[PDB]
Design an enzyme around this catalytic site. Structure first.
Site, PDB file in Angstrom:
ATOM      1  N   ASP A   1       0.714  -1.257  -0.226  1.00 15.36           N
ATOM      2  CA  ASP A   1       0.569  -0.025   0.038  1.00 15.36           C
ATOM      3  C   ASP A   1       0.582   1.522  -0.254  1.00 15.36           C
ATOM      4  O   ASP A   1       2.475   1.348   0.207  1.00 15.36           O
ATOM      5  CB  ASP A   1      -0.806  -0.011   0.751  1.00 15.36           C
ATOM      6  CG  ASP A   1      -0.465   0.115   2.734  1.00 15.36           C
ATOM      7  OD1 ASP A   1       0.567  -1.004   2.533  1.00 15.36           O
ATOM      8  OD2 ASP A   1      -0.555   0.705   3.764  1.00 15.36           O
TER       9      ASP A   1
ATOM     10  N   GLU B   1       0.088  -1.969   5.853  1.00 14.43           N
ATOM     11  CA  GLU B   1       1.499  -1.156   7.260  1.00 14.43           C
ATOM     12  C   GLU B   1       0.920  -0.265   7.462  1.00 14.43           C
ATOM     13  O   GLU B   1       0.865  -0.190   8.232  1.00 14.43           O
ATOM     14  CB  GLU B   1       2.566  -1.479   6.052  1.00 14.43           C
ATOM     15  CG  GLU B   1       3.442  -1.069   6.639  1.00 14.43           C
ATOM     16  CD  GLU B   1       4.203  -0.528   7.808  1.00 14.43           C
ATOM     17  OE1 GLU B   1       3.545   0.680   7.439  1.00 14.43           O
ATOM     18  OE2 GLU B   1       4.792  -0.131   8.039  1.00 14.43           O
TER      19      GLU B   1
END
Ligand SMILES: Nc1ccc([N+](=O)[O-])cc1C(=O)O
Ligand SMILES: Nc1ccc([N+](=O)[O-])cc1C(=O)O
Lengths: 420, 420
Positions: A83, A153
């Site tokens: 991400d 994350e």
């Protein structure tokens, strides 16, 4: 051996850049990491690293692949996240949500541009390539190298009415991949640390501070003048509470600074969001207003304390509020980190040419996926090229990126040929 | 105070029974905990504990509510799980998958019957009631009582092609509830321990052992005679490999038994499932067969070691196989347990009438949601009436359940009035 792989890596300087941009180009804000995961899986599959998709959701998942070794050696995990920080339309948080930097990646000069490259496809590109070099250069390792690309994350968390698939992040992230087989002896989390390694990171606790006032009145009946702190409008008392908390925040970091072998943890505070009443019925001011606070914790602070502190700050103002925590995570210092530390250091000195230096306090006071590994007894530290995205840097130097790939590789050749 | 609440509980003995059966009757195997969570949510809401739904999915979620306290005291968490072991049609694992006991609950005599009551609505019923008693008796607490009812307690884990919403369990379970606000100073996990408290539980690692053979042949061309270990049919080599692993399993528990303050951990091994080839195309024997093993870990065993052990068991037979772990969780011993241990102990002596004794090894050698609390620094131990469902007991004595409710209540009264 080491000289073979090094020359090999110079062979893939183009491949290194391409993988970075191709990966960088994919729109992958937290919540839409799927598209990038598919790219890495295919990239990994294409290179014989035999990937697997580990995930809670079929469009948000981690990719785990590995370069098998001859046997009886320590196994090292290489980690980075899929991400990126900015969604295509995040007009709520950025004055200019349309800057090219936020959503694309490109090679404009010996450097690579894009927030999505710094965080975090640049580093991922590096170890992805480093693993390729070892395999293609047929290097000898007794231990497995695990290639972990994870999702979620970044620190997005569900709260209130935002629950479920779209808002989840780190619960379905690296800790999931690990608890479901992406385990190794040691793990190296690759992120921009500016070639400085850290084996400490901070936990966090999120508080939703809601302050009560009232009673609501139709605007033609609102009573004035009244003191801010006695206002019936909860937005006004919140105004005061925000300023008290801002001073508390100023001190919180100083008091809770802690120096560790791994780094120096300076835990900061920020008010990430506020909201009281609704924009489409403002004729009546609201009897309650809320703010959302992000409070970092050193590895040794119990969040219940911090809540009680914030609870106190509220009481000093004579306000009535509800302080409730909706997120708690722990930060860890690596134990038994030495073998990886040492392996990393030799490689670094050989390539960069000088010793590793203490990381900056911010890089040790955030959330990185080292915490899950350390949480589960896989000793972990973080190391990569460039300067932190939160800083925030906007580019990488391809030479630096190339160096980091060599270090990753050399670290592997070193560490993976030692017996645990 | 203590006597006020005690007389109150005798006031709600029927409500105690009704709540258990009503709860026990709801079909709530792991994967369908939704109906039961809704039941508890409303029950909690009806009684003013102001519940909240914490979950990854809108039909599988935890319920957190709390009995607010006056202030400045330690807060205590009560925990139990919504799910039950056997689905309505689990013909794969049970010879008589239709026994009334597996899927219902009833009051047949001073005891309550049902696997779903023993595991685990009987205990949940106990402290849910205890909370009711305190609130209704207006007992004095300086600290909050947190009521956490969770999903995904049972060890169902996604693997291979079984991923996602239906197969997830503890990842979305209690650890989710805690990481998202269900935090307390201490936590008591209510499950059947036979009125013996234990503050240690075991980890686990799941291995998928796949053995390769071959080449495939149409049955009329299968070569015989051949030694088992040399068979082309992967099911045959697996037959041999299963017996080797069974002998390794007998020794594993003996070698790795460890004594802890919280208990004595006897970590067992089991082969939970096997499958090679498919039942609807059997004309060709399969070139590979798999087994799924459940290996428990004492808090100090590294899952990487146990894999190498089993990899070894395979190598000794000269077999070629793939040993890969698809689940890893850690077991913990409580630290800083004394305040709860004592608070518990005093109540126990008063109600049960004698000192508490060391728990049975199985109860310290399993997975209980104490591990998530301890993982995150909330000291936790498990205590409840009756004998373990894994045993497996099939009923509870209404008297013991009433006692357990008295102990929970008394524990809260003690512990919640201590300042941290
Ligand atoms: N782990 C991170 C999480 C968030 C952000 N950010 O700036 O949004 C940066 C990092 C980082 O690694 O620098
Ligand atoms: N936590 C448990 C999980 C599973 C089972 N089981 O027998 O399937 C029992 C228990 C228990 O608490 O006894």
């Amino acid at each position: 051996d080491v000289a073979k792989v090094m020359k090999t890596l110079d062979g893939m300087r183009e491949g290194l850049i391409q993988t970075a941009v191709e990966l960088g180009s994919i729109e992958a804000p937290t919540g839409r990491e799927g598209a990038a995961g598919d790219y890495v899986y295919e990239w990994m599959a294409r290179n014989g690293f035999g990937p697997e998709r580990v995930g809670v959701f079929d469009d948000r998942f981690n990719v785990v692949g590995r370069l098998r070794g001859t046997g009886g050696g320590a196994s090292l995990s290489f980690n980075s996240h899929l991400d990126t920080i900015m969604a295509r339309e995040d007009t709520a948080r950025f004055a200019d949500a349309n800057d090219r930097i936020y959503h694309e990646a490109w090679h404009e000069e010996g450097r690579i541009y894009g927030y999505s490259v710094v965080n975090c496809k640049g580093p991922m590109a590096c170890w992805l390539i480093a693993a390729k070099a070892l395999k293609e250069a047929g290097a000898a390792l007794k231990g497995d190298v695990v290639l972990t690309a994870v999702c979620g994350e970044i620190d997005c968390e569900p709260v209130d009415e935002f629950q479920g698939h779209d808002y989840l992040a780190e619960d379905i992230g690296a800790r999931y991949a690990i608890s479901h087989g992406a385990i190794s002896d040691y793990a190296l989390v690759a992120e921009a640390t500016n070639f400085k390694p850290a084996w400490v990171e901070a936990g966090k606790v999120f508080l939703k501070v809601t302050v009560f006032a009232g009673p609501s009145r139709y605007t033609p009946y609102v009573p004035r003048p009244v003191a801010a702190l006695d206002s019936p409008n909860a937005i006004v008392r919140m105004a005061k509470l925000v300023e008290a908390l801002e001073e508390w925040a100023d001190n919180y970091e100083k008091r809770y600074t802690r120096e560790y072998g791994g780094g120096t943890v300076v835990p900061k505070v920020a008010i990430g969001a506020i909201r009281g009443g609704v924009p489409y019925k403002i004729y009546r001011f609201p009897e309650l207003c809320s703010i959302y606070m992000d409070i970092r914790l050193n590895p040794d602070t119990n969040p219940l304390v911090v809540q009680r502190e914030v609870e106190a700050v509220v009481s000093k103002l004579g306000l009535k509020a509800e302080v409730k925590p909706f997120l708690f995570r722990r930060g860890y210092e690596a134990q038994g980190i030495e073998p990886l530390q040492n392996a990393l250091e030799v490689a670094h000195r050989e390539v960069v040419g000088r010793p590793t230096e203490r990381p900056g306090s911010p890089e040790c006071s955030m959330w990185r996926d080292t915490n899950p590994y350390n949480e589960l007894g896989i000793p972990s530290l973080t190391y990569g090229c460039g300067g932190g995205a939160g800083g925030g840097n906007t580019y990488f130097l391809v030479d630096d990126m190339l160096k980091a790939a060599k270090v990753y590789a050399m670290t592997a050749m070193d560490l993976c040929n030692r017996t645990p």
